[PDB]
């Protein structure tokens, strides 16, 4: 059952929304402000839970996807982002370390590619579950490398210049279609994992 | 004025925002103020240090000028048109703020002139020049803390304004708003019930009667 | 980053010349103007120091550190205090023939109120 | 198509996002100061003013065609270069920039 | 019909004020913060309108006044003043142009001189259309000239200090009766224009 | 008149208006700090402090006369130039500041 | 006491205190960095992390006895020296650290 | 009647609490931090008031105590102490000197001796009217004489080290018996006055 809700009582703790959130098992957010600004369907990561996740992810795990491990790290990046968001507003940008900048920066990539959904079905708005894992795999493979570089010495700015080409590709993931690489995932994504490694070795040195 | 129903969720988060802001900026302030105190003490000492060493070398040069005959120092000033000790500036993040720092590099453009050699009188200027170079180089390195110190001086005033500004204007405005709309909001839920209940009593009475 | 390389001076003769032997200021060859100002106490006017200060802070955008004798900063006191920038840094040093007074130093004056 | 462009949906999306950021930044200027602000936020402050005084200011008897209105929307949008605009599909962007 | 109402909830959110406001064509607010500074009747641009204004200002224009233009500007000068004041309070005035002070400064003169008009005499209680024109005309003229003065060289402080007595001369015009000068325009306001122009040259200097 | 000044009400208007201004100036002192404050605020800061411990502090078995209160007001109110004292008429003001 | 050791009440004072200080210290790290961060708070920054990731993170069918729970507690506090666990008796602390 | 109240609906501004503060003549707060420290009741000087104080100080003064003078001074010291700490944060230590430093120190000794109790001893739970009078008499005598001594030339650390035995003996008066000078009268305090005079000679010189 996919059920839409909306307020109806002039309150944010309204009788329709409260009694339904109890009986529901998957809760995926959505914010009105983001949706107007162009990010529909929108999603709120701290105002969501899903009880079925544990079995379902394990199902995707056996078929090919490395899926469970990725899911926890995507939320994690976004959690730290909220904390960062308040410091960023107040003090500014001129005080955050190299690690913290990345957290925001990979967060941008997820916001761009998942939360926005270009068209009815144009711009390949249809992503299969296996493509989605590949879209995510590209960002978190980038996050771990990105976290290692700053830690092993490499300025946020330097690391951004040097990443260059592999970063544009992951940014461009949503226009691409999986039906011309295999049939459900892209040969282009497999090639992307090799390219990441190569880039990283040059850039660190 | 303020919203009729449910500002409270928003105002809750406004209340939270305000309050986190005050804590963090007071920590940022706390680190700047703590570092500044230490730097203030270094500086008071250093000023005495620089003055004493600079003057000892000053007195040695002054005697030299008089003994050699004539005011040598006018001649030296014109003749000199390049500098050995320059600085290349670098940014250092201390206490979340970016400061300017200076790093000296000693260029070998000049090391001897045409006034440190004259014959016998020249040997005196030379002995003076050497005390001044050693004394001064130290003074340049100590001067580096000054530049940063002045930027710190500026930043503490701004940062202090902010902790006090969140405290006085924002937090109590947020208390006053949240209360007035909470009380209105509650009034709606209770009066609604009261009007409906009061009418029911009548409707019930009529049916019993007829 | 780098935009300032010179260390300049406002000081008495023996102090200035010595600073130059140590190798810290220079004269620009294109303008024919010194990045130091010689001064002699009681003998040279209060007004000229005030101009030279403006030449060094606001017209020279290459002076990294402006050094200044305490006795001398005291003559043009308004001018030294009112400039609150670190670009140039102002470094008041005890003037030749005088000890260290902590209140002839512009940055310290400012420090006392609000830590 | 034939009375409205294909860019039309894209164009609205861009105006909201910048207009929104600009508003958010103006509020932070007020409390904490301009230490929070950044260069991007300056583009945004500047973008709020251009939008309010050009797009939203018009007659009570000054009617327009739809094609003109999309042409004026574009004018405001010229101040961010292509790489900071991502509320339009890049394909469409290259045509009308 | 000109009808007073009041709060009943200690707001303008209560059913009484809002219903009567729904119907109305002229709205003249209430400002507790201005009332303390001794201003009565206390209004602000943000809490008042008249849908009759456009047609009314043209009518006033005929009689002699520059009234349409001055009313546009009257609104703008008070609205800009409010936004600026929030930053001065919270951040400081020391992070803000001399120019932004100027808007506030001219605005203040309008705040005391207009708003407080409760009067202690008939002379301070009556203000004909001509007199109302005159006091507004001198203040806008001051603003325009002052921003120039500081911009070509002249500090803030020097400008403030210099105009001095003139700020007062307009302040006191209300206390003096309007039957004076040519008609209902004081010779004190007539001279005041020359004094203003004579002042800008000195301030600038 | 004959028991009150007619100036009595007029004097009240200075006292109330300054008190407020003063109260605002103290609010800015708390936030910004004295160095930041301008000359107008400093005077007003000063007025506020004098008002609290002298005007509204009196004994609890101590009577006052209306004449006497106004004479106390004039001294305390005397901390501003004639430009700034303008909530009373120049005639009455010239006599007493 | 008999199936729980005596140290339970004492240990709870230390874990609670550090945990509080620890939330605040992480927000401070984000701004100040680690070039001017306080030493007490630096250990508390690391403390926030372990308190979550081992004392609060456990298995699905992982069961731990109360004695055991107490031991883990001391292990997290073991990093701090005695002079930053000063709200506890030297007899108890010397045994349990 | 001492009645306890907590928040009801979770707001402590709701009608119940607010109705009762108006009726009350006596208020003594509770704070979670102060409660952890073993100060009970958890009061300072602004989370508490008594309007019964007036009649009560008069009652006690009659009995023999010099009570009204000493009590007022108790309140003043706590209020000041708080205030000098804020100055140390914003202004700095430049506004701090040793006269102020003694003020902080007297308040600390007053907190420990008065505010902290938990019934460690039997003499820490019943302390007569005459004993309470005697504790405040030591601390005010220390205060005035420490300040005099630093003005004829002494330092805070020097005063602290020098007062020492007496300072320790008077803190520990709560553990000590209240039957030492009779049955309600404590002998140590009577012998403090003389020690303090000889002590003041050691601190100055």
UniProtKB/Swiss-Prot annotation, chains A, E, H:
Sites bearing Phosphoserine, chain numbering? 62
Record's protein name: V-type proton ATPase catalytic subunit A, 2nd part
Give the encoding gene's name. VMA1
Swiss-Prot record, chain B:
Membrane topology, as annotated, equals: Peripheral membrane protein
What is any one GO biological process for this UniProt entry? endosomal lumen acidification
Chain segments annotated as coiled-coil in the UniProt record: none
Is Transmembrane one of the keywords? Answer: no
- Role, per record: Subunit of the V1 complex of vacuolar(H+)-ATPase (V-ATPase), a multisubunit enzyme composed of a peripheral complex (V1) that hydrolyzes ATP and a membrane integral complex (V0) that translocates protons. V-ATPase is responsible for acidifying and maintaining the pH of intracellular compartments.
Q: Which family does it belong to?
A: Belongs to the V-ATPase D subunit family.
Name the UniProt record assigns to this protein = V-type proton ATPase subunit D
Protein encoded by which gene: VMA8
Q: Which residues of the full protein are shown?
A: 8 to 217 of 256
Swiss-Prot record, chain C:
Give any single GO term for biological process: proton transmembrane transport
Cell compartments where the protein resides: Vacuole membrane
The membrane topology noted for this protein in its Swiss-Prot or TrEMBL record is: Peripheral membrane protein
Further notes on this entry? Present with 4050 molecules/cell in log phase SD medium.
Q: Does the keyword Ion transport apply?
A: yes
> What is this protein's name?
V-type proton ATPase subunit F
Q: Does the keyword Ion transport apply?
A: yes
User: What assembly does the database describe for this protein?
Assistant: V-ATPase is a heteromultimeric enzyme composed of a peripheral catalytic V1 complex (components A to H) attached to an integral membrane V0 proton pore complex (components: a, c, c', c'', d, e, f and VOA1).
- What InterPro entries is this protein classified in? ATPase_V1-cplx_f_g_su, ATPase_V1-cplx_fsu_euk, ATPase_V1_fsu_sf
Please give the GO cellular component terms listed in this UniProt entry.
fungal-type vacuole membrane; Golgi membrane; membrane; proton-transporting V-type ATPase complex; vacuolar proton-transporting V-type ATPase complex; vacuolar proton-transporting V-type ATPase, V1 domain
Provide the species name. Answer: Saccharomyces cerevisiae (strain ATCC 204508 / S288c) (Baker's yeast)
* Keywords associated with the record: Hydrogen ion transport, Ion transport, Membrane, Transport, Vacuole
Report a single Gene Ontology molecular function. proton-transporting ATPase activity, rotational mechanism
UniProtKB/Swiss-Prot annotation, chains D, F, G:
Its biological purpose: Non-catalytic subunit of the V1 complex of vacuolar(H+)-ATPase (V-ATPase), a multisubunit enzyme composed of a peripheral complex (V1) that hydrolyzes ATP and a membrane integral complex (V0) that translocates protons. V-ATPase is responsible for acidifying and maintaining the pH of intracellular compartments.
Q: How does it assemble?
A: V-ATPase is a heteromultimeric enzyme composed of a peripheral catalytic V1 complex (components A to H) attached to an integral membrane V0 proton pore complex (components: a, c, c', c'', d, e, f and VOA1). Interacts with RAV1 and RAV2 components of the RAVE complex, which are essential for the stability and assembly of V-ATPase.
Gene symbol here is VMA2
Q: Which residues form a coiled coil?
A: none
Full protein stretch here: 389 to 485 of 517
Can you name this protein? V-type proton ATPase subunit B
Its family?
Answer: Belongs to the ATPase alpha/beta chains family.
Q: Which organism is it from?
A: Saccharomyces cerevisiae (strain ATCC 204508 / S288c)
Give the free-text miscellaneous remark of the entry: Present with 131000 molecules/cell in log phase SD medium.
Q: Which domain of life is it from?
A: Eukaryota
Top-down, what is the taxonomic lineage of the species of origin?
A: Eukaryota, Fungi, Dikarya, Ascomycota, Saccharomycotina
Where does this polypeptide localize? Vacuole membrane
